Symmetry: D2
Subunit: 160 residues, 4 copies
Amino acid sequence: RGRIELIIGPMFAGKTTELMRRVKREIHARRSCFVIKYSRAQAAVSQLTEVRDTWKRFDVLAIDEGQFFSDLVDFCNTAADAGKVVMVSALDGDYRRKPFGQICELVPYCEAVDKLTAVCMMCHEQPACFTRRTVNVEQQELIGGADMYIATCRECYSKQ
Amino acid sequence: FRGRIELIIGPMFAGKTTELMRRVKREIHARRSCFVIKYSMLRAQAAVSQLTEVRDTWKRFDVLAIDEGQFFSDLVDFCNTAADAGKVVMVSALDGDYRRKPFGQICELVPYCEAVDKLTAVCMMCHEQPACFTRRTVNVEQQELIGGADMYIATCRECYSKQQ
Amino acid sequence: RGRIELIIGPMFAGKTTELMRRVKREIHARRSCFVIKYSRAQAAVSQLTEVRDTWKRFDVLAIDEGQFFSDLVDFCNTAADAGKVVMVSALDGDYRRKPFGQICELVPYCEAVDKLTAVCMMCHEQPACFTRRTVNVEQQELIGGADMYIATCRECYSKQ
Amino acid sequence: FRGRIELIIGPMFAGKTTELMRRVKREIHARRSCFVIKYSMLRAQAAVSQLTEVRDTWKRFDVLAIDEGQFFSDLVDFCNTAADAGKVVMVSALDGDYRRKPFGQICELVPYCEAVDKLTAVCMMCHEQPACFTRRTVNVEQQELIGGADMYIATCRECYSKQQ
Ligand SMILES: Cc1cn([C@H]2C[C@H](O)[C@@H](CO)O2)c(=O)[nH]c1=O
Ligand SMILES: Cc1cn([C@H]2C[C@H](O)[C@@H](CO)O2)c(=O)[nH]c1=O
Ligand SMILES: Cc1cn([C@H]2C[C@H](O)[C@@H](CO)O2)c(=O)[nH]c1=O
Ligand SMILES: Cc1cn([C@H]2C[C@H](O)[C@@H](CO)O2)c(=O)[nH]c1=O
Ligand SMILES: [Zn+2]
Ligand SMILES: [Zn+2]
Ligand SMILES: [Zn+2]
Ligand SMILES: [Zn+2]
């Protein structure tokens, strides 16, 4: 009775809000959730290995920014097979729409995948599924918000 | 270039209001103006017992978010008027009461909606099954009894029909 | 481990195709499905009462055109509480967008509700959620297809 | 007035192809022209081992439906080209192989999709749990081995890791 659930989409689609909705949901039913942020129980780390066997002591595991963790697949699968509810929120693509981190390897292991949309910040009348980086950096990992990224539809992604 | 009605339903503690607000924050981010109507340049939060206490205010916004849509008697016409004026109308509401009887005007609204999403909670009794109904814990009959976890729990089908 | 699932939307949204998808799905896993059409096992009736306790002898019950059955709620709930998977495909609204049959009473009893869309037959570039009747009849129950009905978006529903 | 990519994924016997065709029949009904590309005025069904065996034919239609999208190596660019030309591109495909390894080009395609829907089947072993993976029943290693229930079954997580 364990599983893996994936929440994907561009930035400003409310993925993290949605992940936390699912958590608050479990918390109300007295189910114990362990929230792992990148860097009720809220740990912050750069790799999931830093969390020991701590996850074993909870019912649900919530992983935000799942993309930045290199061991995402095996960690999740181990947790899932131990009877945990694993929930991941993550960008499916980078600012170039290249597969981001380990997410695409995780999809075949998921029993649920939900792709959320944002609203397009350029035409403001179309659902947004991609992220455009506004600054001139190349490196894929560049943490930040609306100062560095904007969400767009297909038309606006290609238009200047 | 069009308007619409979106409905968000399910039992209590399914995160319906969180979800409604997700959709709002989403619009706010794209500089679209949202008008939030709770029961009792870009973001406005009015609190009302009947929707037509708003008159034409809604016209001055892009999106209308109605929380607890069930408690409003004129929900259908208000929404349809807004939808036909090219507004994005979003309603969060209980589809059923503590008895699983149709709650307010929601079921009239479904045929007018272009989207309906039913959210689930987790069952507060067996804690290992998705919850779709609301059970009242106190011993009161009146349908409208505003409150939280002190008076209500969300449950699956098995636990709804059972005690303790 | 029983439940009620509702599939709604206008005509030509593929509701019946979707219901049958869910059936074929169960059939492959050797789960027994009982299909009740209005008028693997396929019975045809004007009221669900005509089906005796036959439903007890199956795992899944599929009800197409659920709107036309007056005892839809109690029948489904009885089946659900007996541990059956009940699946209903039905119009949520009539040609006037008035609640059709018993469906709206059924929603509070459902653990899943999925609303499908069609494509708008007038503007042909917008998702359709309503049905327009093309003939001049008033009676809500008038069985037929594209000769008598067309699916539309909101704009086209009100336009001549 | 725009184009897009839609992806339909899940294990075998989830009704992915039925679903793809639902979406097609839907378009056909509204007089929109669909071009169905299977592997190996309004409706056309071509059968191909590489998508660019189609050249420009796709330009003469509104919608492109690609079944078994996994077996095509140029899936991403073909779809994106079509999407950017204002086509509605619809792909049905296995996200994973019998080993749950990424199947073909699908995982590259996800970041380009505006919709992704993952369907489930029913587990052929325990018969009371939703199935999200495909188990191969025969004793073959090669990834591409076309066939049906004689060679594959769909399973939940528990049954995937267990025998018989
Ligand atoms: C789009 C994108 C976001 N990010 C970052 C910005 C955010 O802090 C986080 C997503 O929530 O990831 C990247 O590192 N690379 C990318 O390509
Ligand atoms: C289920 C249910 C909820 N409520 C109220 C309690 C909460 O204050 C509110 C949930 O937003 O709905 C009723 O008044 N009656 C009911 O039957
Ligand atoms: C829209 C509509 C359809 N129908 C019929 C036509 C179809 O045969 C069936 C829906 O599949 O119901 C009605 O009886 N009343 C209505 O209002
Ligand atoms: C899961 C899986 C399916 N298939 C094929 C079998 C079927 O003919 C086809 C399903 O449409 O995919 C493979 O070739 N390899 C695999 O690993
Ligand atoms: Zn745009
Ligand atoms: Zn329960
Ligand atoms: Zn239209
Ligand atoms: Zn199983």
